[PDB]
């Protein structure tokens, strides 16, 4: 009889999805001023008597600041050399080390290179998961969760995935410059003449309106992945969620009466991640933060 666990006065919110199955919805919010990262993760548990395995739907959202900066290169001679640092690739990952836990799905599953991204994950009673690459369809599942994020001029693709981990990467792709398209590897990307030898470092590079949101502001992630647990066995398990970025450098040295020289330092600062360690309590269906960096 007494099988829904909690403490006195808990805020336990559950969605009854029909039959002897329900969904226990939990959320956690972690911020970090050091890394400029906010993790707004939803933890939707799947209680189902017709399912012989515990299930946890993790929807990872939030915001990862672009960490873009325009600076002068201090020192004599570098009075006409300016430096731009911008994010080349955003990192979202979920890794675990519990042997009794394994990942059963993840969205996006395949590399997608459109400006907008909208995908759905559905659940039918009995342990049936299937994912549709749209937010189209009306009420085929007992419970559905969607992902939604825009990645202008970037490309979302899976980098690592197996039974204990999954890692995405939103790499830079193609940009629209006033003189045609420019690839993400064009060393002369984002550089321009600063109109004289007194302009600011900011004037040595493209305006803010020629920069996509992922370069100016940042990236709002929206990734889903589900993990299964064998009933019994382990009562608690841990996993880590990484929100990060990779930074490139684009120096723009100005030469008078001649031209503006440019060169790119690719992957100068990698793994600029904010990793948070969570712990699941499969008995009480609750999440808690163990720590972060």
């Amino acid at each position, epitope marked *: *009889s*007494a*099988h*829904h*666990h*909690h*403490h*006195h*006065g*808990s*805020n*336990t*919110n*559950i*969605e*009854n999805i029909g039959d002897g199955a*329900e969904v226990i919805k939990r959320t956690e919010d972690v911020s970090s001023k050091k890394w400029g990262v906010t993790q707004n993760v939803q933890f939707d548990f799947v209680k189902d008597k017709k399912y012989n395995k515990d299930a946890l739907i993790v929807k990872m959202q939030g915001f990862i600041n672009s960490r873009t900066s325009f600076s002068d290169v201090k020192g004599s001679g570098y009075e006409l050399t300016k430096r731009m640092i911008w994010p080349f690739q955003y990192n979202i990952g979920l890794t675990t080390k519990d042997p009794n836990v394994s990942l059963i799905n993840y969205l996006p599953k395949n590399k997608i290179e459109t400006t907008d991204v909208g995908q759905t994950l559905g659940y039918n009673i009995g342990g049936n998961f299937q994912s549709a690459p749209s937010i189209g369809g009306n009420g085929s599942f007992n419970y559905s969760k969607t992902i939604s994020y825009t990645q202008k001029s970037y490309v979302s693709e899976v980098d690592k995935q197996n039974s204990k981990s999954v890692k995405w990467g939103v790499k830079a792709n193609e940009f629209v410059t006033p003189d045609g398209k420019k690839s993400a590897h064009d060393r002369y990307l984002f550089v321009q003449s600063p109109n004289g030898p007194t302009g600011s470092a900011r004037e040595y590079f493209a305006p803010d309106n020629q920069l996509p949101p992922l370069v100016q502001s940042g990236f709002n992630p929206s990734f889903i992945t589900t993990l299964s647990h064998e009933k019994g066995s382990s009562d608690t398990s841990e996993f880590e969620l990484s929100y990060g970025r990779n930074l490139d450098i684009t120096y723009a040295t100005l030469f008078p009466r001649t031209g503006i020289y440019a060169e790119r330092k690719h992957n100068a600062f990698v793994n600029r991640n904010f990793v948070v360690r969570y712990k699941v*309590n499969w*008995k*009480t269906h*609750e999440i*808690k933060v163990k720590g972060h960096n």
Partner: antibody
Amino acid sequence: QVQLQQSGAELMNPGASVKISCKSTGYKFSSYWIEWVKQRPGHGLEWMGEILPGSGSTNHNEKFKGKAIFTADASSNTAYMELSSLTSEDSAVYYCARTISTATDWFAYWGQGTLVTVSA
Amino acid sequence: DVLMTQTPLSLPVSLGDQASISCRSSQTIVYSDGNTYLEWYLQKPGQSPKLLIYKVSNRFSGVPDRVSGSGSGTDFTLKISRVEAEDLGVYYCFQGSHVPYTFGGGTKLEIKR
């Protein structure tokens, strides 16, 4: 306008049933458990059970597993409890209690109580 | 479904003395989150139960300073500094960390006029 305002007095013949209310204001149930407590006149306080309304998922004590049924209506703002096979044992006062934990401070509300008399 | 054994059953106390109520659980009340969810309730006659102290020690809004609760593990104690004629009634210890929830045997506090 009292947070948990219960039903009035009641008289039901033995063997029958009765369903009492617990009209609940307070911001949002369907997320916060509401429990029921029984008090014999012999100074005995006994915890019956609770229910999460928005889910209907109940959680009761084995003593009242065959004697108490918990329901709740999200359309209005009420939760109910029904008692089967009324005997002289079940003649008591029944309170409903809600409690909210939050992070700063802590709330605990109770109802005035509903008297249930089992006679003919 | 743990047992809650209160002691004493009847505790007389004069106007100004100190009254202490012990309550011991048949299992450690510590929940997996780390907090011990023990509570003390006061039911004056003809009224609904009123909460005094939540989570062993933390006092409730509107509780006088004479009240203080302590304890650890399974044995707990509620103490009243300067007992007054308005504090009489029945005191119950309640556990809220393990379902099903259970109350205490009740402790009747009478005055000595």
